[PDB]
Structure 1
Amino acid sequence: GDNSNVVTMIRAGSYPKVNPTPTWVRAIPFEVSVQSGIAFKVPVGSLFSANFRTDSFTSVTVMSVRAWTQLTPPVNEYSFVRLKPLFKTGDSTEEFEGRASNINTRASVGYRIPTNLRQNTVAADNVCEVRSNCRQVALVISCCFN
């Protein structure tokens, strides 16, 4: 085992349980555009794409959302980014926020979804609202594609 130099025989038995289309836990990176003073609803459909090897999925269970400002903030200001989670059974009002302490540095923050709120979404659903003084925010969403 891990020590041979040639092919060896496998004494296979019965035909096992199979599944050609299994689930997949992923940390999907992508960016969204953000206007000043306006909240942007992140579509779940942005997680289904051939750029991520996920165009074969139609449902996803989101587990946590992390955000980073992707461009520089306005003059004289430090970057900030806010996140309001959204849920189909009822949206929240939390505004998890992070700010940069160095004007040249990104702002970041995230939120975890409790187990009791980890159901499936589809491309028409929205994950959360994003607010920032920077015109583009980079998101890394950890989720289970099924």
Structure 2
Amino acid sequence: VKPNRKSTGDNSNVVTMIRAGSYPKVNPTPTWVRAIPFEVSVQSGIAFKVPVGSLFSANFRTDSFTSVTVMSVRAWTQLTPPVNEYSFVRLKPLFKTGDSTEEFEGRASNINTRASVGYRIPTNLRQNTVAADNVCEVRSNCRQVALVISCCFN
């Protein structure tokens, strides 16, 4: 059928016609895979529950989502540790179907450096969580902790 006509082709500098056909399947409000960096405050000796509602905010463009499937969690000490000590952080995953008892701990080897640790959620436990829910318990000698949660907004 005289193969192709159109205008120019590939390496071009002008508008070119698109020979559309049938109206396609669309979606104005799709899903989105994201890594949300945010900080949380932590006292000494007390485990802070990281709420899922912190992922939902306009500071991440996600204030339009009402549910999230968490995949992995990573956390860095945000501040310096007490005098003479090396930073440290722990993570206990929490699941609406059953809270786990792990304390995935990572320590720093230099006092001036951040302590880092993180955990992966298996596929059979990636389920939606709402703002009211909590993702995990954080502990640390440091007063603030920076997280980077890899999750799927839908």
**Range of TM-score over shorter length:** over 0.9
User: How many Å apart are 1:2 and its aligned residue?
Assistant: 4.7
TM-score (norm 2): 0.94
Question: Match for residue 83 of structure 1?
Answer: 91
Query: For residues 111 and 11 of structure 2, what CA distance do their matches in structure 1 show?
Result: 54
Question: Match for residue 116 of structure 1?
Answer: 124
TM-score (norm 1): 0.99
Query: For residues 137 and 24 of structure 1, what CA distance do their matches in structure 2 show?
Result: 25
> Secondary structure of the equivalent of 1:21?
coil
Offset from partner CA, 1:6-36 (integer Å, 9 cap, x none):
0000000000000100000000000000000
2:16 equivalent to 1:11: no
Question: Match for residue 56 of structure 1?
Answer: 64
Offset from partner CA, 1:83-127 (integer Å, 9 cap, x none):
000000000000000001000000000000000000000000000
> Secondary structure of the equivalent of 2:128?
coil
Specify every segment of 5 or more residues in structure 1 that has no aligned partner in the other structure, as ranges. Answer: none
> Secondary structure of the equivalent of 2:129?
coil
Question: Match for residue 102 of structure 1?
Answer: 110
Query: For residues 111 and 145 of structure 1, what CA distance do their matches in structure 2 show?
Result: 19
Query: For residues 142 and 21 of structure 1, what CA distance do their matches in structure 2 show?
Result: 20
User: How many Å apart are 1:3 and its aligned residue?
Assistant: 1.2
Query: For residues 53 and 11 of structure 2, what CA distance do their matches in structure 1 show?
Result: 46
Specify every segment of 5 or more residues in structure 2 that has no aligned partner in the other structure, as ranges. Answer: 1-8
| Structure whose CA Rg is larger | 2
Taking only the aligned residue pairs, the percentage that are identical comes to 100
For the aligned residue pairs, the C-alpha RMSD in angstroms reads 0.6
